[PDB]
């Protein structure tokens, strides 16, 4: 509703939502936006706050902050029956990872403002093999419905969790373990049919895996399991020998054609304290489990180190010209290429904090603690 800049490359504007910067007296906020479900979430150390993106719900869970993800409402695709009046009010669900306990609320409507003692009786819970004693904690979460949900821990373990059975009824089951080391990217791939979709996993060691996950009684399969670290290092070492010992893999994003991925890395030149961010386009051959680096680009408009150990930069690629957005703590860099490279930056003021993001087919949505949701729409 408020456009802050529009030029021939992009629009940056607010997205009016039910997010409020006064949900909590707590500076540290976890959160993200799910444009596909239509709701955003923030939590502190006490409560999760669920808010509509189209103009809220408080779920007390009581310490360190849990990790929360939203789930889709129980859909009944292609029924012969007339729809219920009451089925048009289900909003979707909520999963809370508190320590080693997964808590799943099928429907958040019935738990609004309920104390945890009693709302817990509305939930399905799953004890996960997380070594809380040893310092293990939930790190990334991906909603990969209709298949289910994927969790990673700060110590590299990956759980595939199912939230329906074979008949759409809510449950919470550990489907499979998909295994210092740590996952840097969990990404949705294409849906393959009833209850099945691909998920892409990238680790900081450069392991890239394509998993076929299903809620439909099938058991997970890897279609690709390769390590890209040395290939990326070799693509850089001749001009940038300081890549040796500094190459770090931050994120990855699938491209259009379903057989290629874009990876975001950095290297560091200690002579002049410059961090260089690298976009590597990689083509994967599923037949032979092999890959090649199609292209390598260095960002020219942003060379800052990421010193916030929490912040993880994130790629967005709208679904000719290819546009690659990278969200940094206080900037969004826009790169475009013929599907010559060129690059724009949107620099944010330093006194606002990004606390998560979301996306649709064309835009990146950035959740800021102090000003709510910002939309970055790249013109293609």
């Amino acid at each position, epitope marked *: 509703s408020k456009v802050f800049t529009e030029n021939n490359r992009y629009i940056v504007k607010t997205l009016q939502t039910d997010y409020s910067s006064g949900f909590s007296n707590d500076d540290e906020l976890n959160g993200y936006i799910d444009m596909q479900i239509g709701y955003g979430l923030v939590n502190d150390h006490k409560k999760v706050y669920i808010w509509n993106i189209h103009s809220y719900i408080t779920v007390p869970f009581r310490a360190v902050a849990p990790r929360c993800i939203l789930t889709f409402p129980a859909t009944m695709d292609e029924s012969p029956l007339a729809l219920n009046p009451n089925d048009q009010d289900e909003t979707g669900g909520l999963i809370i990872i508190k320590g080693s306990k997964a808590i799943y609320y099928e429907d958040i409507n019935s738990i609004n403002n309920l104390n945890f003692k009693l709302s817990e009786k509305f939930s399905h819970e799953l004890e996960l093999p997380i070594n809380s004693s040893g310092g293990e904690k939930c790190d990334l979460m991906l909603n990969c419905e209709p298949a289910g949900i994927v969790l990673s821990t700060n110590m590299g373990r990956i759980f595939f969790i199912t939230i329906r059975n074979s008949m759409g009824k809510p449950q919470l089951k550990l489907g499979k373990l998909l295994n210092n080391s740590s996952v840097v990217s969990l990404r949705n791939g294409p849906i393959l049919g009833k209850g099945t979709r691909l998920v892409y996993i990238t680790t900081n060691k450069g392991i890239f895996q394509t998993w076929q996950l299903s809620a439909t009684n099938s058991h997970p399969t890897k279609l690709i*399991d*390769v390590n*890209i670290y*040395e*290939a990326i290092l*070799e693509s850089l070492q001749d001009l940038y020998p300081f890549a040796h010992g500094t190459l770090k893999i931050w994120d990855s994003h699938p491209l259009q054609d379903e057989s290629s991925q874009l990876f975001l890395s950095s290297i560091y030149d200690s002579s002049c304290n410059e961090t260089y961010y690298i976009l590597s386009t990689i083509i994967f*051959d599923s037949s*032979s*489990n*092999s*890959f*090649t*680096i199609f292209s390598t680009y260095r960002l020219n408009t942003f060379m800052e180190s990421i010193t916030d150990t929490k912040f993880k930069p994130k790629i967005f690629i709208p679904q000719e010209v290819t546009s690659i957005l990278v969200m940094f703590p206080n900037a969004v860099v826009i790169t475009q290429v013929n599907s010559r490279k060129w690059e724009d930056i949107v620099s944010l003021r330093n006194d606002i904090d990004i606390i998560g993001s979301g996306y649709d087919s064309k835009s990146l949505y950035v959740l800021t603690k102090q000003m709510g949701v910002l939309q970055f729409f790249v013109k293609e």
Partner: nanobody
Amino acid sequence: QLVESGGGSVQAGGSLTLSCTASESISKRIHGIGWFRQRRGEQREEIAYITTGGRPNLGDSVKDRFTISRDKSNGTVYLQMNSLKPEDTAVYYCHGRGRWWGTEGRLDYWGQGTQVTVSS
């Protein structure tokens, strides 16, 4: 296929030229063409390389004596070995530095290897 030619026996201070001819399809799957030397009872060691763009590179043990070049008319790559020494005696392999990577690492291409012998 990578095909290599030009080996033989010469005296110290002599000269030989090795060549490496690559098919169209292989040339597409590599960054450059190089040569590995393997003395006997030793391991292979890369001594020369030239990128597809003609950027040459020579290992320290040969760089004042050998030249690597490409003929762009046919893509053949040549290692001209001047100032030869008895310790240049080895099998020489031409080598394509692969663009593709698998579970075992980079997928390179090898020639069959040719014998060079230098007597003193």
